[PDB]
A paper describes a structure:
We next obtained structures of Sa GlnR and Lm GlnR bound to a 21 bp glnR consensus operator site to 2.35 and 3.45 Å, respectively, by X-ray crystallography. The Lm and Sa GlnRs form comparable dimers to the Bs GlnR and dock on the DNA similarly. As observed in the Bs structure, both DNA sites bound by Sa and Lm GlnR are bent inward but the DNA from the Lm complex is slightly less bent (~21°) compared to the Sa and Bs structures (~25°). However, like Bs GlnR, the Sa and Lm GlnR surfaces that contact the DNA are both electropositive, indicating electrostatics as a general contributor to GlnR DNA binding. The GlnR DNA used for crystallization contains four conserved bps (bolded) in each half-site, 5′-CGTGTCAGATAATCTGACACG-3′ (where the consensus binding site is N1N2T3G4T5N6A7N(7)T7’N6’A5’C4’A3’N2’N1’; N indicates any nucleotide). These conserved bps are contacted in the major groove by Lm and Sa GlnR residues that are completely conserved among GlnRs; a conserved tyrosine (Sa Tyr32/Lm Tyr31) makes hydrophobic contacts to the DNA thymine3 (T3) methyl group, an arginine (Sa Arg28/Lm Arg27) specifically reads the G4 base and makes hydrophobic interactions with the methyl moiety of T5 and finally, the side chain methylene carbons of a conserved arginine (Sa Arg31/Lm Arg30) contacts the T7′ methyl group. However, GlnR proteins contain different wing residues, which our structures show make distinct contacts to the minor groove; wing residues Bs Arg46 and Sa Lys48 make nonspecific base contacts in the minor groove, but the corresponding Lm GlnR residue, His47, makes hydrophobic contacts to a ribose. To test the role of this wing residue in operator DNA-binding affinity, we mutated the Sa GlnR Lys48 residue to arginine and histidine, which are found in Bs and Lm GlnR and performed FP studies. The Kds determined in these experiments were 9.9 ± 0.8 nM, 8.0 ± 0.6 nM, and 11.6 ± 0.6 nM for WT Sa GlnR(1-87), Sa GlnR(1-87)K48R, and Sa GlnR(1-87)K48H, respectively. Thus, these data indicate that the different wing contacts by GlnR proteins do not significantly impact operator binding affinity. The Sa GlnR dimer is generated by interacting N-terminal loops, while the Lm and the Bs N-terminal regions fold into distorted helices that interact.
Numbering used by the authors:
A (entry chain E), B (entry chain B): 6 to 83
Write the structure that this text describes.
Amino acid sequence: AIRRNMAVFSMSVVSKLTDLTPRQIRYYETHELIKPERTEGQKRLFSLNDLERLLEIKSLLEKGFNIKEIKQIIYDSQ
Amino acid sequence: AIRRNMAVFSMSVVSKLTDLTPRQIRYYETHELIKPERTEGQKRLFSLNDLERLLEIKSLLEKGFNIKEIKQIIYDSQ
DNA sequence: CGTGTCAGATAATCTGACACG
DNA sequence: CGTGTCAGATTATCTGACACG
Ligand SMILES: [Ca+2]
């Protein structure tokens, strides 16, 4: 009943779910790889969709790909 | 992430999902109807099962039951 | 008795910049 | 150029106390 586009996870929980630091997660948003929702105080809130996109980035980073290369891939799989 | 016993939601998220104020939520804990995980800094983190538990409490209060009636309804056998 | 509300304290996340491999 | 760390700032949640239906 919690939908995959619902912003429900805070930084620290998302970081534990993904084994990525607050630093890496913020960096991928800076490079337009992801864009989580913000509370009114501008804190980030992640959805399950965000969860899946961060893991996608993690893997391709561990297959040796650049950030600029990962941009191409996440937006050309079709 | 759908480990139903995994603490993933902060107070404000649980609040919005349950339609209960943090005041109500913390009160039901102090009267031992729910006990959520804590970060090392003692903020609360709730699971999907916590969510179910809160919603149960909410509906039972809505039906006229005391806090101590509800504590019997939920615990003894499970 | 259960909740709203405000007060002070502490934790958590914010941006930005230097440093490192 | 991808990540760590440290500074300062603000937001979010903490406990506890007074009000009030
Ligand atoms: Ca928002």
